[PDB]
Every structure is written in structure tokens, then in C-alpha cells.
PDB file of C-alpha atoms and ligand atoms in Angstrom:
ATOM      1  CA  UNK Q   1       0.000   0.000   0.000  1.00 32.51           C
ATOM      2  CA  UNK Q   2       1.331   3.304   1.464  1.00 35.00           C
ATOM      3  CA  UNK Q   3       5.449   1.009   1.227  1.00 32.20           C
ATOM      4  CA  UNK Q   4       6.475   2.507   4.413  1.00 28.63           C
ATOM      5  CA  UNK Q   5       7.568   0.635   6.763  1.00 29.50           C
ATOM      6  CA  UNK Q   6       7.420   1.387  10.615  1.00 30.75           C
ATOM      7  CA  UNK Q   7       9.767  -1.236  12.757  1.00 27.94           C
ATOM      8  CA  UNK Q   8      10.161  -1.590  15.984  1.00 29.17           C
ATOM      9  CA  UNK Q   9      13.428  -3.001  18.151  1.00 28.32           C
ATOM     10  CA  UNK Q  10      11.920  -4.522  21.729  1.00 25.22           C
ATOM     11  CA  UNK Q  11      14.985  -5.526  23.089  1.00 23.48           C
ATOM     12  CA  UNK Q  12      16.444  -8.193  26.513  1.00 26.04           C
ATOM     13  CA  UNK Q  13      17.728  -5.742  29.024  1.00 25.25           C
ATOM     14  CA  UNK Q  14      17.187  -8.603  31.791  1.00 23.91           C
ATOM     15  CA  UNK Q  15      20.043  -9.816  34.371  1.00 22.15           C
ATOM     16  CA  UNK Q  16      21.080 -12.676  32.227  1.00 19.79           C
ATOM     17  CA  UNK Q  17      23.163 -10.269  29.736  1.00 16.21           C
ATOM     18  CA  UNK Q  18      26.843  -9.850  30.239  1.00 16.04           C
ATOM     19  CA  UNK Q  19      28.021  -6.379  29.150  1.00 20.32           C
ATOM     20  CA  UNK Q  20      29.661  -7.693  26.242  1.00 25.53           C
ATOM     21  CA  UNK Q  21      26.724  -9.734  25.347  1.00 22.83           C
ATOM     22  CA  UNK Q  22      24.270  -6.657  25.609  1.00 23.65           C
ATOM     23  CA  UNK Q  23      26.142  -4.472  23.184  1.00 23.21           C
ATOM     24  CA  UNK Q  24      26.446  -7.148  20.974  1.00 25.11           C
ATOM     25  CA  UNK Q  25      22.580  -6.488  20.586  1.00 26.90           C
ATOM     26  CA  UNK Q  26      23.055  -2.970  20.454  1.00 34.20           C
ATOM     27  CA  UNK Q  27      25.525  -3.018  17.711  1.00 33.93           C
ATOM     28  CA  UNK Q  28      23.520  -5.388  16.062  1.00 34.60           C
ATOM     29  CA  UNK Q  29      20.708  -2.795  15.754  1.00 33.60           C
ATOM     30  CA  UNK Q  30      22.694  -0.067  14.978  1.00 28.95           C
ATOM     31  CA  UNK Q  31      23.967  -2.177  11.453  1.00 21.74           C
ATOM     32  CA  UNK Q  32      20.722  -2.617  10.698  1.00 23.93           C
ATOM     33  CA  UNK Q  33      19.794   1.186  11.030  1.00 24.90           C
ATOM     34  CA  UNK Q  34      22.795   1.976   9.284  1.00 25.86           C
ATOM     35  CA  UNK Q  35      22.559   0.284   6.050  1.00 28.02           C
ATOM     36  CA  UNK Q  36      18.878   1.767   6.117  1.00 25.67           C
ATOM     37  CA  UNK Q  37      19.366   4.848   6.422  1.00 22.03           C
ATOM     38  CA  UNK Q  38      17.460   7.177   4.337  1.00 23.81           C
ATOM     39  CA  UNK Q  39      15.111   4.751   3.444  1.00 23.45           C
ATOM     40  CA  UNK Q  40      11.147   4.533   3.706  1.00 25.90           C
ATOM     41  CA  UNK Q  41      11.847   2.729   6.904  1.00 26.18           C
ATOM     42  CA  UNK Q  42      11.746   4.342  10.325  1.00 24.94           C
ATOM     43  CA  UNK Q  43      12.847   3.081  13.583  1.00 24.82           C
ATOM     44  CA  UNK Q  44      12.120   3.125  17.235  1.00 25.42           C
ATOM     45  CA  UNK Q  45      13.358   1.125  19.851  1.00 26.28           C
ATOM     46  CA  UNK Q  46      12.259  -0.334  23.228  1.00 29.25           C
ATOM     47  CA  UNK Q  47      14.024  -2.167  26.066  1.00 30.54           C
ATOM     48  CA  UNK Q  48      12.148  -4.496  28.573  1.00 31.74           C
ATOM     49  CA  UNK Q  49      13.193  -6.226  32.050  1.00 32.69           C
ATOM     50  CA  UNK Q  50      10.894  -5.953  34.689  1.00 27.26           C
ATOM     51  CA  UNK Q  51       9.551  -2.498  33.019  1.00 29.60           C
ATOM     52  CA  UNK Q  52       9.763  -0.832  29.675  1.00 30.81           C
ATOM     53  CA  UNK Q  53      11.640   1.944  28.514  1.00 31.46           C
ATOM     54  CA  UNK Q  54      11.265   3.693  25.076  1.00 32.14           C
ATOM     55  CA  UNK Q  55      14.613   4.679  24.357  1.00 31.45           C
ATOM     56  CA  UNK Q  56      13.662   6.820  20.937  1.00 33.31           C
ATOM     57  CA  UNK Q  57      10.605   7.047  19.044  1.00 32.97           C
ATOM     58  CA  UNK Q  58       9.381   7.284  15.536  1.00 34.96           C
ATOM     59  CA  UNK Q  59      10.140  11.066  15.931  1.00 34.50           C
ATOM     60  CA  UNK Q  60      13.079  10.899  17.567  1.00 32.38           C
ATOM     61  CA  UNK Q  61      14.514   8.918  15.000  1.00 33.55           C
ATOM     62  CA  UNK Q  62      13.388  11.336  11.906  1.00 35.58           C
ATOM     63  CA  UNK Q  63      14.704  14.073  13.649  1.00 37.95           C
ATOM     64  CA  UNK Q  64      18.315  13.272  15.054  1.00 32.56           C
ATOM     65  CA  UNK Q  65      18.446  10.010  12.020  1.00 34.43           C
ATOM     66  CA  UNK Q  66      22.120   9.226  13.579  1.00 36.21           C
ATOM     67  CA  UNK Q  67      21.769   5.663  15.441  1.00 36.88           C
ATOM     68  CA  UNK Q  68      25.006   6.289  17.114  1.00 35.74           C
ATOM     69  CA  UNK Q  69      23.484   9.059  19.348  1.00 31.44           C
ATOM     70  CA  UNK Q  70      20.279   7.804  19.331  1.00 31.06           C
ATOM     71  CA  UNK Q  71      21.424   4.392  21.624  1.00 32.55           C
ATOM     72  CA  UNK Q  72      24.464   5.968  23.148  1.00 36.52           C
ATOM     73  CA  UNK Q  73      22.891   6.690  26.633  1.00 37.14           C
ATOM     74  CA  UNK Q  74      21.104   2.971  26.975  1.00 32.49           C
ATOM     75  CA  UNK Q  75      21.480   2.225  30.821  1.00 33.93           C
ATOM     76  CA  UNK Q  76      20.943  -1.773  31.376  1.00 32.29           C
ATOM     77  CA  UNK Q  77      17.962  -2.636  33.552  1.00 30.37           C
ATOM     78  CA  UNK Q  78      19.430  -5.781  35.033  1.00 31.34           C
ATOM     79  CA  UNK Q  79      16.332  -7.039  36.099  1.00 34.56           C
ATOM     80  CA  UNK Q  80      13.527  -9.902  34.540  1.00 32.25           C
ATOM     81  CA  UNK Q  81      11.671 -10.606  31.181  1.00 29.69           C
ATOM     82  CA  UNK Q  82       8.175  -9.259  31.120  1.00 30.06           C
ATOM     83  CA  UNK Q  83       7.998 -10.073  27.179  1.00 28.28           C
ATOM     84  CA  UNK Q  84       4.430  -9.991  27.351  1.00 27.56           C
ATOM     85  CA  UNK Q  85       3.808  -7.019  28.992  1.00 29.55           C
ATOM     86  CA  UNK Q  86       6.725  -5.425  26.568  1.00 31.71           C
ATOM     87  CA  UNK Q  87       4.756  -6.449  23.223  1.00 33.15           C
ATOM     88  CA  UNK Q  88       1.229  -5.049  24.700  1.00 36.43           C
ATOM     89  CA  UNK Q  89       3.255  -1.617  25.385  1.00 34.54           C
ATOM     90  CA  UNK Q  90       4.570  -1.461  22.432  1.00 36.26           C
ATOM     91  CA  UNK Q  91       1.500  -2.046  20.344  1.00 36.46           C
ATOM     92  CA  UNK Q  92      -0.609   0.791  22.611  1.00 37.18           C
ATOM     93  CA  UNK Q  93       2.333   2.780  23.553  1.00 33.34           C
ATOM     94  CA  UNK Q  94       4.959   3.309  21.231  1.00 30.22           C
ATOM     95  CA  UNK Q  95       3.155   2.700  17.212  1.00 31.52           C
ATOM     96  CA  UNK Q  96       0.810   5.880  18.024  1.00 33.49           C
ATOM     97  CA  UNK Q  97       0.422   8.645  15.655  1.00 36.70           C
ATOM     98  CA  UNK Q  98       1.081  11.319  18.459  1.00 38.50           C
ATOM     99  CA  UNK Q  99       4.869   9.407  18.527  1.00 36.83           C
ATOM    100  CA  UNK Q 100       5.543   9.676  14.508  1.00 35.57           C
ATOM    101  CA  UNK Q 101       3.828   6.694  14.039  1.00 34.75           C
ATOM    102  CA  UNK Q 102       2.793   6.788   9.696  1.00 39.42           C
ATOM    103  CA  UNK Q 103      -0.951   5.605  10.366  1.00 44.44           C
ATOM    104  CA  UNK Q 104      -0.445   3.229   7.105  1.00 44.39           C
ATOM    105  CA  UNK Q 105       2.253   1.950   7.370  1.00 40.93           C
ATOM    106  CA  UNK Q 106       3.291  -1.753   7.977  1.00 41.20           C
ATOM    107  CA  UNK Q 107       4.455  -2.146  11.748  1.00 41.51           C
ATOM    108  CA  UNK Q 108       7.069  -4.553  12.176  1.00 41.16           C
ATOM    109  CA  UNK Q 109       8.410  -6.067  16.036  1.00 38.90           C
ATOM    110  CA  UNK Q 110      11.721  -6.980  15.863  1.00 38.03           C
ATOM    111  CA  UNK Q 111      12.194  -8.854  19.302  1.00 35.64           C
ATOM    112  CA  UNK Q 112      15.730 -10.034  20.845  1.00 34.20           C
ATOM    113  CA  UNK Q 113      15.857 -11.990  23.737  1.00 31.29           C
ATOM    114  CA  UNK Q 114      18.081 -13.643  25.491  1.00 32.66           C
ATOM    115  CA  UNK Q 115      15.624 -16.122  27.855  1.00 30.54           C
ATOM    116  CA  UNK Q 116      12.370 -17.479  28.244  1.00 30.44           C
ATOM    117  CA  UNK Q 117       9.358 -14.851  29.681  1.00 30.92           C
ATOM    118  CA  UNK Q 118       9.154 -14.025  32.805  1.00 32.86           C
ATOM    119  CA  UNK Q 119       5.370 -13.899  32.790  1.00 33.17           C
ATOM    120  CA  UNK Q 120       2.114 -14.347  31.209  1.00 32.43           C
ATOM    121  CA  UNK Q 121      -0.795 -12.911  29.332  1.00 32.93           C
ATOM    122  CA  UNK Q 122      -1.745 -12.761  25.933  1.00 31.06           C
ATOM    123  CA  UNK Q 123      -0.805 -10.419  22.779  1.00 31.07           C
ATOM    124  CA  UNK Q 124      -4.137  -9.793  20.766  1.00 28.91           C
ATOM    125  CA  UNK Q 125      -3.371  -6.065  21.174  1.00 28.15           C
ATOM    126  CA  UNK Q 126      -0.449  -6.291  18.887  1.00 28.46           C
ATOM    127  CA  UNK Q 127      -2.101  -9.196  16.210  1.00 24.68           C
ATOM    128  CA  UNK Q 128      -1.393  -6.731  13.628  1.00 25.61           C
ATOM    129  CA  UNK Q 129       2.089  -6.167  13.794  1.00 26.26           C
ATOM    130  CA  UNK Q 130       4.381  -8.505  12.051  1.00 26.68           C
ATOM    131  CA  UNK Q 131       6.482 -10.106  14.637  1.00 27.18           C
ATOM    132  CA  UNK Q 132      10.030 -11.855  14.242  1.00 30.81           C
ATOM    133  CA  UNK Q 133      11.531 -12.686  17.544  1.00 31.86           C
ATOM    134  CA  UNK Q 134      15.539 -13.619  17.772  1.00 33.48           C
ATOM    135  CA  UNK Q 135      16.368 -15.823  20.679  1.00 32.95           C
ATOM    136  CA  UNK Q 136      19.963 -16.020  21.537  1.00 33.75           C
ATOM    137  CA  UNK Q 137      21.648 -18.469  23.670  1.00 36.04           C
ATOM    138  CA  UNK Q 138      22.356 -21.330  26.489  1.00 36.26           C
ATOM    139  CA  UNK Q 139      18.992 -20.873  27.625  1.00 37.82           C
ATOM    140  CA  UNK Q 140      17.708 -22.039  23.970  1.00 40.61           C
ATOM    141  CA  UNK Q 141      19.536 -24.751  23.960  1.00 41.51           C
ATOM    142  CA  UNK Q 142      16.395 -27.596  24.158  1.00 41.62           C
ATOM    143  CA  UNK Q 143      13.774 -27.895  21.756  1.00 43.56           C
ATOM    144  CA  UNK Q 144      11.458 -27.442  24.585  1.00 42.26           C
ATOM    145  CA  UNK Q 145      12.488 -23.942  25.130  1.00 43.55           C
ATOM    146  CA  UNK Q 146      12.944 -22.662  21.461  1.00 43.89           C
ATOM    147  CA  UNK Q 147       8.534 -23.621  20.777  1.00 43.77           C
ATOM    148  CA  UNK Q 148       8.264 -21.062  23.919  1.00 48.19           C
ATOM    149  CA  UNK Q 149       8.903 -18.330  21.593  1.00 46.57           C
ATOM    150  CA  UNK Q 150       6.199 -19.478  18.919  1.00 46.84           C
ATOM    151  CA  UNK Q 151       3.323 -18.010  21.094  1.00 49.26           C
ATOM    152  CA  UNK Q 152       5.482 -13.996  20.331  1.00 49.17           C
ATOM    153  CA  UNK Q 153       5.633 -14.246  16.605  1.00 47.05           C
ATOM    154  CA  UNK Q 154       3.613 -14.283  13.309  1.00 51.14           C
ATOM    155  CA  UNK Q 155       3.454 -17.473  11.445  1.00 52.37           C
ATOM    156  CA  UNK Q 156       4.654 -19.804  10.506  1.00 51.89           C
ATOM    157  CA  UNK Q 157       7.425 -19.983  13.175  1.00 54.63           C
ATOM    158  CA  UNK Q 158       9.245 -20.882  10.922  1.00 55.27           C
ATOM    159  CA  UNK Q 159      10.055 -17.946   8.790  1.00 56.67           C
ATOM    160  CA  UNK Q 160       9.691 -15.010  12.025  1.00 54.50           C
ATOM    161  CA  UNK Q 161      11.445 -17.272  14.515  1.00 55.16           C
ATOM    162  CA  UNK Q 162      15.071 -17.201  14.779  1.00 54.04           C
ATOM    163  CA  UNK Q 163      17.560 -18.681  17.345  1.00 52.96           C
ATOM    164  CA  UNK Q 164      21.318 -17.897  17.546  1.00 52.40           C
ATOM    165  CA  UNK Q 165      23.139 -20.068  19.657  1.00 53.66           C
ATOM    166  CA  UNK Q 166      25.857 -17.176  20.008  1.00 54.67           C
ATOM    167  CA  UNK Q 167      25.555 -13.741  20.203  1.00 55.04           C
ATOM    168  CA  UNK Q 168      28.439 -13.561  17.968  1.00 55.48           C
ATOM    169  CA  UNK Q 169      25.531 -15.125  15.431  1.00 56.72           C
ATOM    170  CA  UNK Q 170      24.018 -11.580  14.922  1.00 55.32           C
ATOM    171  CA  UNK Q 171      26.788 -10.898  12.539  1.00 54.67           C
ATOM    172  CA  UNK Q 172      26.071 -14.183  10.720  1.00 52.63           C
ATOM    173  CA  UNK Q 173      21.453 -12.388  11.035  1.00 53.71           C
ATOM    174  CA  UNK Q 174      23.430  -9.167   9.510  1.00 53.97           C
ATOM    175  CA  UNK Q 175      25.085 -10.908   6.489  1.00 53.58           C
ATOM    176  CA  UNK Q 176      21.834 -12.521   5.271  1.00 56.65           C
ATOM    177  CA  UNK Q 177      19.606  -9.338   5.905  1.00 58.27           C
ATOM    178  CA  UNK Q 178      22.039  -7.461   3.484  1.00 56.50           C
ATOM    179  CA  UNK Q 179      21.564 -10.185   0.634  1.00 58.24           C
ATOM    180  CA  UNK Q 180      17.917  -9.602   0.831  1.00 54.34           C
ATOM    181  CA  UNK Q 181      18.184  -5.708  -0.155  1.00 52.81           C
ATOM    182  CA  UNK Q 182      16.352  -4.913  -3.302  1.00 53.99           C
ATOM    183  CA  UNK Q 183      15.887  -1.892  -5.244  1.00 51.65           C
ATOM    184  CA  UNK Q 184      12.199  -2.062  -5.894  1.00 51.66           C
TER     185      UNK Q 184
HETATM  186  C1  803 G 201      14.735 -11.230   5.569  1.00 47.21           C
HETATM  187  C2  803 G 201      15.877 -12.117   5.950  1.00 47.21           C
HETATM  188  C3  803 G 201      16.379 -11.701   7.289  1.00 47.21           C
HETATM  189  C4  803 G 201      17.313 -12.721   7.847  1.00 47.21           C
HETATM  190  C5  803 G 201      15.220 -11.452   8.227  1.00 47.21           C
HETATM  191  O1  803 G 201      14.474 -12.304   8.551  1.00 47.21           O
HETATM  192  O2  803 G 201      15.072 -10.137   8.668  1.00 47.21           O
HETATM  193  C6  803 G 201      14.000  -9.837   9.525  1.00 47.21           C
HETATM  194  C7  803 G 201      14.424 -10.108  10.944  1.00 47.21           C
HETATM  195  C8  803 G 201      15.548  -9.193  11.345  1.00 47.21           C
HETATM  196  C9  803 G 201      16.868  -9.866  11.108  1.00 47.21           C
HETATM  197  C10 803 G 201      15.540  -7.868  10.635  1.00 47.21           C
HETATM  198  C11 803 G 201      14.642  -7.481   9.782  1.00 47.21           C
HETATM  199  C12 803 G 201      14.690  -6.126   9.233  1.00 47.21           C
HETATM  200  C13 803 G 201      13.826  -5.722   8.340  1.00 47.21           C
HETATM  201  C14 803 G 201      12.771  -6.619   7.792  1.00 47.21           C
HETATM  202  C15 803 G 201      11.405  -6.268   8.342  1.00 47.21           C
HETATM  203  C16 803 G 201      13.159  -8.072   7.963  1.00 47.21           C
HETATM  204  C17 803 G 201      12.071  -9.035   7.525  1.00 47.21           C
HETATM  205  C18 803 G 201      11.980  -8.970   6.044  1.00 47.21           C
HETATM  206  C19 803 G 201      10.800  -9.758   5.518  1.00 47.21           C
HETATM  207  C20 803 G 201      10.811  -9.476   4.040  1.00 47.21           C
HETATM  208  C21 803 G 201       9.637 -10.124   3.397  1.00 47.21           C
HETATM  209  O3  803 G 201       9.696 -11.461   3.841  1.00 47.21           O
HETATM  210  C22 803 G 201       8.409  -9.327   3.828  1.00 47.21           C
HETATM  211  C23 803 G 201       8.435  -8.977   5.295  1.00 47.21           C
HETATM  212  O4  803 G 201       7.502  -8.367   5.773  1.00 47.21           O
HETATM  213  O5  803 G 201       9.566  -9.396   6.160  1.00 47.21           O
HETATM  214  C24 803 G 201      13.565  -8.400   9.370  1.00 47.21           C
HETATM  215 MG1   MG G 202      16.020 -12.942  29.529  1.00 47.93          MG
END
């Protein structure tokens, strides 16, 4: 329809994340943002624990455009994984028109996590927003654990969920996103 595309970064800011490890996610986000710049995509981004923070909006973004100031002053929250709570406050909270939200546009989550949720609910509020989540790590190891992060994400799982057993594996994500940009 309208081709813009409004995405969303809900990002692990939980205990489980070494330092290292939670710049690796940062970084990670900032590539992507990069090689998009000055496209008909915008960005915001959002990290969970216990709480939710929105650390720039839609208008943010379209004003200042730089990711490297945009995530330099991202304090860790060190605490749990509310990943239901995070997707409902995204969907009422963060794609709003009032926020630079393009009411048209397709709305994209973009979900990295590190560990299984911390509680419970459901996501109807957010049905309409396409939803890939990224789960990283030991605590993916089983089968059992991976099929938690089905109920998050669009289907089939098997296209919009993704699991990196390293964070070093987000390079590996970056690499394939790039051969998948078209000029359209
Ligand atoms: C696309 C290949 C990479 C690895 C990936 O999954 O990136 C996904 C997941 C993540 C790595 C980053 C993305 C950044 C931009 C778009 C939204 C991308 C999904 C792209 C697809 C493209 C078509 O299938 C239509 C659509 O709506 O989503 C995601
Ligand atoms: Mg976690």
C-alpha cells in the first residue's frame, strides 16, 4: 500500500546479559539502522526487564536520524523478562500517531531476547504487527524452550522465529539481511 515501513526493536535488558553480550545487541541494531538509512523505513526502539523503557521514538529517530546518538545513553535494567507485557506496550504505547507513528504503514516487532518470559498474558493487542523474535543463547539450547517463543511471533514460526546459539551469530542475522536488499 502506502510502502512505508514502521519497525520496531523490543529488546532483553534482563540480568542474564553480560556487558559484552548486551552491546552485541546494540551493535547489532545499529547495522541494521545503518545500512537503512534514508530509506522509507523508520525506527524506534524499546528495552524491557521488569519495566519498559522507550529509548527513541518514531520522531526521535526522523529528527536526530544518527543511530550512534540515538542508543548511546542505553542504561541496562538488570532485572527480569516481562515479554508480554513489553509487546502489549509497544503495540498501545509506542506505534501511536502522536509518537511519529505513519498511520499506514506496515508495523514490524523486531524482538531479541536472550531467555524465556518471565510472565504471562496474551498479545491480541499487537495481532497486527508482524512479529520476528531472535532468541539467543544457552537458555535455547532444548527444543522445549525454542517452541516457547512461537506463542510472540507471526506465522509460521518458521520464517519469524530465529535462534542464535551465540551472540556472535548476529553478525552471521546481519550478512543474510544485506543479501535480501532490493531496489524495488
Ligand atoms: C529477511 C531475511 C532476514 C534474515 C530477516 O528475517 O530479517 C528480519 C528479521 C531481522 C533480522 C531484521 C529485519 C529487518 C527488516 C525486515 C522487516 C526483515 C524481515 C523482512 C521480511 C521481508 C519479506 O519477507 C516481507 C516482510 O515483511 O519481512 C527483518
Ligand atoms: Mg532474559
Amino acid at each position: 500500500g502506502s510502502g512505508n515501513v514502521d519497525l520496531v526493536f523490543l529488546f532483553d535488558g534482563s540480568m542474564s546479559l553480560q556487558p559484552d553480550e548486551f552491546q552485541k545487541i546494540l551493535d547489532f541494531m545499529k547495522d541494521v539502522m545503518k545500512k537503512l538509512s534514508n530509506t522509507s523505513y523508520q525506527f524506534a526502539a524499546v528495552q524491557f526487564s521488569t519495566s519498559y523503557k522507550t529509548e527513541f521514538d518514531f520522531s526521535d529517530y526522523v529528527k536526530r536520524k544518527d543511530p550512534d546518538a540515538l542508543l548511546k545513553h542505553v542504561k541496562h535494567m538488570l532485572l527480569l523478562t516481562n515479554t508480554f507485557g513489553a509487546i502489549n506496550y509497544v503495540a498501545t504505547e509506542v506505534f501511536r500517531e502522536e509518537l511519529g507513528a505513519r498511520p499506514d504503514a506496515t508495523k514490524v516487532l523486531i524482538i531479541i531476547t536472550d531467555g524465556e518470559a518471565t510472565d504471562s498474558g496474551n498479545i491480541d493487542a499487537a495481532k497486527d504487527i508482524i512479529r520476528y523474535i531472535i532468541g539467543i543463547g544457552k537458555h535455547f539450547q532444548t527444543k522445549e524452550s525454542q517452541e516457547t517463543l512461537h506463542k510472540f511471533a507471526s506465522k509460521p514460526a518458521s520464517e519469524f522465529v530465529k535462534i542464535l546459539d551465540t551472540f556472535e551469530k548476529l553478525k552471521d542475522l546481519f550478512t543474510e539481511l544485506q543479501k535480501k536488499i532490493y531496489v524495488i
